[PDB]
């Protein structure tokens, strides 16, 4: 058993997802403002088991996001179908490599950290519904998912 092998997989895969997200159109404006920010615990140092769950949770939520009506964006459906699938592939992969171990995930689900991460993503899904899934809302979400993928990349250092 080792986390170093999982570090090599999540790095290879977030690159596969970040490329797919980039291919939606061609311009990601990181200054696209919206009041919701990734929880402070994610940027901060966290446990070895807790990271793998944080990744899974983020990929599960990023999946749930792209399921919504993206009709207003004029993005290529083919690429969004492709993205959801590569996202879901890893979501299934992470859950299976944390199958034999069962105690620490329960501790992680009752954590204030996980709750804060889920509170954050609730605000992301709520935002899109309020703005009635128009282009500006998605332009903001794409930029946020980019920033999120970088956080997934920052978290992979916590495995070594």
């Amino acid at each position: 058993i080792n986390y170093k092998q999982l570090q090599l997989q999540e790095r290879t895969n977030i690159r596969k997802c970040q490329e797919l997200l980039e291919q939606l159109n061609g311009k990601i404006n990181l200054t696209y403002r919206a009041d919701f920010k990734i929880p402070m615990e994610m940027t901060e140092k966290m446990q070895k088991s807790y990271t793998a769950f944080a990744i899974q949770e983020m990929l599960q939520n990023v999946f749930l996001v792209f399921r919504n009506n993206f009709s207003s964006t004029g993005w290529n459906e083919t690429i969004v179908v492709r993205l959801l699938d590569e996202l879901h592939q890893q979501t299934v992969f992470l859950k299976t490599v944390l199958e034999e171990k069962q105690e620490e995930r329960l501790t992680w689900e009752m954590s204030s950290t996980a709750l804060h991460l889920k509170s954050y993503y609730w605000r992301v899904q709520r935002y899109l519904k309020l703005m009635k899934y128009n282009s500006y809302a998605w332009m903001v979400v794409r930029a946020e998912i980019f920033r999120n993928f970088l956080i997934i990349r920052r978290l992979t250092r916590n495995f070594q």
Partner: protein, 318 residues
């Protein structure tokens, strides 16, 4: 006074508050209780289930708790389901586990009436659901034409070869579709290269079947959904196997070709230079010990990490 929460229903439509933040209630006893996060006290209502029958199969269409709501709106991928099937009068229940929102129960007897029960489980957040109200359905009489059998997909990278045993139509569905919540699924995508084929040989390119993972379909009912992952994984290289034939035990050492070798899982494939049967076992560490082998006989070992044939003759007995 206590508050009971069953999904998005409370006890003492389009606009609702955050289920993960601090929330409170005031009713006018002068109600003002302990502030809590609703996500911990909320119960799971049974999943909605609709049955559909065929000759030798039953389709169980599972809808997750909430239509769709907010309490489980972000928990949907976490949920797993357990199905219980039996004939109407029987007491022995067959158990099938599923993550899929449509689980086809096969190998069933035609014109027989079976009853179903679906449980929604949250395998990570401790919680579970009370089984759904029992639902019964009867199978139809066997079709004049049977559905295709064993499927195998051998791919040459950019082209896929679909080999099977028996006009034939084929449909493809992306991997995440059968696994993620319905309401919008499962609309199967078509295949022009295999829509009305004359042969069992089916060839299709990556342009049409664009997802990394997908399911395949093969008036007759639909065949078993064949799931195939298309990944350019030419990793890792074979390990270096070492055999030490001792008096009795035949010690086998698996060495990974990228060290440190601290946390790894190993597999063994051993046989005899006269038999055409392969025996296989997996251990925690790399030190495999082949015990109770016939003496003065040649044994061929092979290994993989999670090798080429290496034949060694045993010892007589000192």
């Amino acid at each position: 006074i206590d508050v009971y929460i069953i999904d998005d229903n409370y006890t003492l439509s389009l606009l609702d508050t955050n289920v993960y933040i601090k929330t409170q209630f005031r009713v006018r006893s002068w109600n003002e209780v302990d502030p809590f996060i609703p996500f911990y006290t909320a119960h799971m209502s049974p999943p909605e289930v609709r049955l559909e029958a065929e000759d030798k199969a039953i389709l169980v269409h599972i809808s997750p708790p909430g239509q769709d709501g907010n309490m489980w709106a972000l928990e949907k991928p976490s949920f797993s389901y357990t199905i219980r099937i039996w004939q109407k009068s029987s007491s022995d229940k067959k158990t099938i586990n599923s993550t899929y929102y449509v689980e086809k129960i096969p190998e069933l007897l035609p014109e027989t009436t079976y009853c179903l029960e679906v449980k929604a489980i949250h395998p990570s957040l401790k919680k579970h659901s009370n089984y759904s109200t029992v639902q019964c359905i009867s199978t139809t009489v066997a079709n004049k034409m049977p559905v295709p059998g064993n499927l195998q997909v051998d791919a040459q990278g950019k082209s896929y070869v679909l080999k099977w045993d028996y006009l034939f139509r084929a449909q493809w569905l992306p991997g995440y579709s059968k696994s993620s919540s319905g309401s919008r699924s499962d609309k199967w995508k078509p295949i022009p290269t295999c829509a009305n084929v004359q042969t069992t040989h089916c060839v299709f390119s990556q342009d049409t079947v664009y997802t990394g993972t997908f399911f395949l379909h093969v008036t007759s009912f639909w065949s078993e959904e064949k799931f195939i992952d298309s990944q350019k994984h030419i990793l890792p290289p074979p390990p270096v196997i070492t055999v030490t034939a001792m008096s009795d035990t035949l010690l086998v050492y698996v060495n990974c070709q990228d060290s440190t070798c601290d946390g790894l899982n190993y597999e063994i494939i051993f046989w005899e230079n006269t038999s055409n049967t392969k025996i296989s076992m997996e251990k925690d560490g790399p030190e495999f010990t082949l015990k109770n082998l016939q003496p003065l006989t040649v044994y061929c070992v092979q290994a993989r990490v999670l090798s080429e044939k290496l034949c060694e003759k045993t010892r007589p007995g000192s």
